[PDB]
Paper text:
BQ.1.1 is a descendant of BA.5 and bears all five recent convergent substitutions (R346T, K444T, L452R, N460K, or F486V). Importantly, BQ.1.1—harboring five convergent substitutions—possesses increased ACE2 binding affinity, pseudovirus infectivity, and fusogenicity, which is attributed to substitutions R346T and N460K. Additional experiments using the S derivatives based on BA.2 and BA.5 showed that the R346T and N460K substitutions significantly increased the S-mediated fusogenicity independently of the S backbone. Together with our recent studies, the results indicated that the N460K substitution, which is detected in BA.2.75, increased ACE2 binding affinity (i.e., decrease in the KD value), increased pseudovirus infectivity and S-mediated fusogenicity.
Numbering used by the authors:
A (entry chain A): 19 to 613
B (entry chain B): 329 to 527
């Protein structure tokens, strides 16, 4: 027996045990997220302990086979991935404490409630109640109340937990030989051992910081434009030179400016609206939303959703019978079990998010053909971008006209295209400075750069500086405002949403060449192009078997992320925004704040 | 003893409340009875009824010296291997059909029957064997497969694996991983009086 044949037989026996334990751990985690109870916590803990003790022994056994004599590469890849920096050996006592911190922060975010000061019985959760106020209200006082109440009652609850969260997440990362937990998350993009296609953890910080500096001009102009239209909506609350108040931004944290569209449409009255109203008028259902998203993926040659997907997903708020984590997520449990968890409302926001989450699932199904150890996205940015290149096509008025949400005779003049490009900018461009700053603060907090006594002095120093957004109420260090976001309190890396935003326009550009689209990128709709889906699928099927640099270079022609296609997409709006800010100021100073 | 004909016990095989593991597959010899293959229908939706070398529509007019019904449970995406000229974990190590197989393969989804929330580990299959199975051969040996070059001495360990693998069927699995009950009818014509006939 050669060492290779023994490694193959080891990987075979490994895959059959690993898939069964991963499924139990996955299903236990699903039960907790759809239904938050103390019993479902300890089931998740026990299934997670069994799963890590399995990797503890397997990653040790895999050392018995030297890579330098495995001629079959795909065997080499599974072996490398099994011994690679995933030990997560913590002491039993410190492993149990980090879980309690994680589970508590997870429970507080989804079950945290602000209650009436005069009536403790009537309360608002974040998901059904406060999100509706932060997405649809127009009262300055009401938005301010919801913004502060959530950060004062739930935010302060998460502050001590998050401090011990970083001291344990950093201790885990160092035992796996990373500089900090931030370097650990960055290792997702790491590639080495492949000449010319390598990529370091440090190279992401340079590439994010330099690509973002090329983004600064486009965002600064949209910022000034939104500022003026917001000056009309609110009488004396905003000056032409200061930052934008954080509680007027379209959602709880200002992560997207999409709900600001109703106040900022360039040509709002005369061009027909491009938004939710017709869904409600046509009595659309949460099922119709996903059936339409499923219809889109099928139209490019991708499969339908499984029968189990419809039986096992939670696609609406379950109600008060169980406490669920309502934030939209996509789940690959293995064994052909695919589910989406989402508390879907009937909005154009939810319509496009359905395409996003189904993009995850389609990626999961495509690379299900890989060996177990290679079933993942090329990187986190790839995974969070697949649904977005479909959202780009589904959001275009050409597609909305063909699926019945716009008039059967739609006038696509010069003006309606600027409406489209602005709303596209409110979402895609608006989330870029929000994303970069939040993750940079985490990296700077994970690294020894931001001390305990000034965790919020720097978070808002970076909001005003980088994002152009200011705190309406002064927050001392009892507050933990970043942890009031789902991804921060639920232990999710956030730079995934920055790299994917460059990746999508790169992919969309290549896919619109595959579909032979003729004009600028923003008129492109790949709906019925089975050839375009073929190019996409040939990469999705790869998983982590190739480095993301090569998978990216074999579809777009660039071994790295790039800002060119994103800026070509928004060029008509870029030169249009210039014309609108003629007697306005583009930029801001940090020296202004309400209180 | 009187001259009276039995009705072929196809219900004993197709309607068993528990099927065998594919590594230890059951075989029932059908003989000296009147077979009515017309009752073999209404299985789980989109079942497979795959015959080779004999027409199932003419089956109620044929006679054979013997009929053999082999039964077992397998994974969904393994069903295609129960046919002549096939390779894979099942056709190589668990159940093999020959090239000249004359018979039928009925396989239907048994997720409601054989899956369990806690996982059904009772159904197993052979994952390692020293060589391929000859057609219609059965191996039930629990001997430790020696992958490495050190002897195992009957103890599972490094490079020494227990040769059987449990499926662990759960109802929430996808169809490719769901259990399928399988019955393999083999129609045998020898130089002998044919004792299994249709109506
Ligand atoms: C690196 O190593 C790997 C593994 O060591 C190697 O991949 C193997 O390549 C050999 C080629 O000789 C494959 O063997 C052939 O398989 C043919 C049928 O393929 C199908 O069935 C395979 C096994 O059946 C499994 O399928 C069911 C579900 O379908 C599953 O539940 C069970 O696991 C069951 O055992 C299956 O692995 C295979 O899928 C692989 O191959 C496809 C094809 O490209 C690929 O797309 C997949 O992603 C996947 O990698 C497929 O589903 C079979 O027809 C053929 O038979 C010939 O040989 C036999 C024996 O000599 C003869 O008897 C017969 O007459 C034919 O001549 C042959 O057996 C093997 O399946 C691969 N295994 C794996 C895990 O991929 C790579 O090639 C190596 N890389 C390099 C560069 O060398
Ligand atoms: C939401 O999650 C809770 C978990 O706290 C679910 O309740 C528990 O579900 C388990 C799993 O079926 C059940 O436990 C059962 O307990 C009984 C009595 O002790 C016994 O027959 C078994 O020991 C069995 O495991 C039971 O339904 C329940 N256990 C409790 C409440 O102690 C609940 O079902 C979930 N809700 C939904 C809608 O899924
Ligand atoms: C992708 O391809 C599908 C199928 O070819 C396209 O759907 C088709 O859309 C046209 C135009 O709406 C339908 O034709 C006519 O539509 C009117 C609606 O006013 C109605 O009277 C009839 O339905 C009539 O046929 C056509 O029926 C419809 N086909 C199907 C199968 O639904 C779709 O528009 C294409 N999408 C893109 C973006 O190209
Ligand atoms: C395994 O058990 C099932 C359940 O008893 C057997 O299915 C039954 O077989 C009989 C005999 O052909 C059939 O009954 C039919 O009922 C319909 C009305 O539903 C009637 O119009 C027909 O004339 C006939 O009497 C039917 O397939 C089924 N009856 C049920 C499920 O109620 C099956 O035959 C057994 N398998 C074997 C191999 O014996
Ligand atoms: C994807 O699923 C849809 C339905 O979910 C399929 O459309 C159905 O196809 C069946 C059989 O082909 C027929 O009853 C009708 O044509 C459709 N029914 C309904 C209710 O829409 C569609 O064919 C599937 N496509 C793929 C590629 O799997
Ligand atoms: C409308 O068209 C005119 C000329 O046809 C052009 O000057 C103007 O920029 C267009 N407006 C928009 C919003 O595209
Ligand atoms: Zn996502």
């Amino acid at each position: 027996s050669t060492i290779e044949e023994q490694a193959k037989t080891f990987l075979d026996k490994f895959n059959h045990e690993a898939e069964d334990l991963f499924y139990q751990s996955s299903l236990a985690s699903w039960n907790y997220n759809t239904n938050i109870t103390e019993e479902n916590v300890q089931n998740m803990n026990n299934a997670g302990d069994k799963w890590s003790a399995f990797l503890k022994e397997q990653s040790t056994l895999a050392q018995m086979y030297p890579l330098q004599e495995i001629q079959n590469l795909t065997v080499k890849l599974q072996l490398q991935a099994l011994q690679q920096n995933g030990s997560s050996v913590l002491s039993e006592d410190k492993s149990k404490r980090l879980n309690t911190i994680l589970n508590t922060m997870s429970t507080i975010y989804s079950t945290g409630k602000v209650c009436n000061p005069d009536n403790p019985q009537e309360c608002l959760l974040l998901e059904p109640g406060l999100n509706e106020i932060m997405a649809n209200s127009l009262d300055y006082n009401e938005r301010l109340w919801a913004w502060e109440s959530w950060r004062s009652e739930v935010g302060k609850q998460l502050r001590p937990l998050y401090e011990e969260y970083v001291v344990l997440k950093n201790e885990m990362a160092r035992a796996n030989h990373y500089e900090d937990y931030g370097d650990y998350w960055r290792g997702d993009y790491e590639v080495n051992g492949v000449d010319g296609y390598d990529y370091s953890r440090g190279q992401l910080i340079e590439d994010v910081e330099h690509t973002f500096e090329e983004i600064k001009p486009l965002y600064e102009h949209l910022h000034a434009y939104v500022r003026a239209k917001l000056m009309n909506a609110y009488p004396s609350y905003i000056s032409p030179i200061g930052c934008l108040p954080a509680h007027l931004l379209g959602d709880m944290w200002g992560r997207f400016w999409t709900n600001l569209y109703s106040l900022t449409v360039p040509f709002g009255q005369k061009p027909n609206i491009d938004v939710t109203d017709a869904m409600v008028d046509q009595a659309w259902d949460a099922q119709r939303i996903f059936k339409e998203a499923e219809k889109f993926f099928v139209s490019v040659g991708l499969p339908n959703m499984t029968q189990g997907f419809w039986e096992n997903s939670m696609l609406t708020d379950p109600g008060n019978v169980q406490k669920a984590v309502c934030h939209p997520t996509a789940w690959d449990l293995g064994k052909g079990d695919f589910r989406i968890l989402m508390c879907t409302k009937v909005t154009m926001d939810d319509f496009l998010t359905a395409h996003h989450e189904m993009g995850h699932i389609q990626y999961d199904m495509a690379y299900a053909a890989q060996p177990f150890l290679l079933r993942n996205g090329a990187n986190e940015g790839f995974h969070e971008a697949v649904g977005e290149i479909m959202s780009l096509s589904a959001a275009t008025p050409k597609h909305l006209k063909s699926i019945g949400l716009l008039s059967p005779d739609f006038q696509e003049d010069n003006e309606t295209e600027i409406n489209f490009l602005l709303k596209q900018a409110l979402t895609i461009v608006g989330t870029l400075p929000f994303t970069y700053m939040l993750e940079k603060w985490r990296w700077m907090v994970f690294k020894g750069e931001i001390p305990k006594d000034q965790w919020m002095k720097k978070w808002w120093e970076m909001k005003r500086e980088i994002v152009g957004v200011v705190e309406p109420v002064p927050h001392d260090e009892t507050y933990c405002d970043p942890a009031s976001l789902f991804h921060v309190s639920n232990d999710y890396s956030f730079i995934r949403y920055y790299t994917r935003t460059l990746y999508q326009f790169q992919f969309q550009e290549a896919l619109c060449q595959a579909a032979k689209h003729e004009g600028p990128l923003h008129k492109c709709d790949i709906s019925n192009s089975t050839e375009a889906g073929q190019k996409l699928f040939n990469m999705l099927r790869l998983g982590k078997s190739e480095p993301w640099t090569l998978a990216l270079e074999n579809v777009v022609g660039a071994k790295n992320m790039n800002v060119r296609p994103l800026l070509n997409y928004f060029e008509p709006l870029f030169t249009w925004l210039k014309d609108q800010n003629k007697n306005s100021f583009v930029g801001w100073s940090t020296d202004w704040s309400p209180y | 003893f009187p001259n009276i004909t039995n009705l072929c016990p196809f219900d004993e095989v197709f309607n068993a409340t528990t099927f065998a593991s594919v590594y230890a597959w059951n075989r029932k010899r059908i003989s000296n009875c009147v077979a009515d293959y017309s009752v073999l229908y209404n299985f789980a939706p989109f079942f497979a009824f795959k015959c080779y070398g004999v027409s199932p529509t003419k089956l109620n007019d044929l006679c054979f010296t013997n009929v053999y019904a082999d039964s077992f449970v397998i994974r969904g995406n393994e069903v295609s291997q129960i046919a002549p000229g096939q390779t894979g974990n099942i056709a190589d190590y668990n159940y093999k059909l020959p090239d000249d197989f004359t018979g039928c393969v009925i396989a239907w989804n048994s997720n409601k029957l054989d899956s369990t929330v806690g996982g059904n580990y009772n159904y197993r299959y052979r994952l390692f064997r020293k060589s391929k199975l000859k057609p219609f051969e059965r191996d039930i040996s629990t001997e430790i497969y020696q992958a490495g070059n050190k002897p195992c001495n009957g103890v599972a360990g490094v490079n020494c694996y227990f040769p059987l693998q449990s499926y662990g069927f759960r109802p929430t699995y996808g169809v490719g991983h769901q259990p399928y009950r399988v019955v393999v009818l083999s129609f045998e014509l020898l130089h002998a009086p044919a004792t299994v006939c249709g109506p």
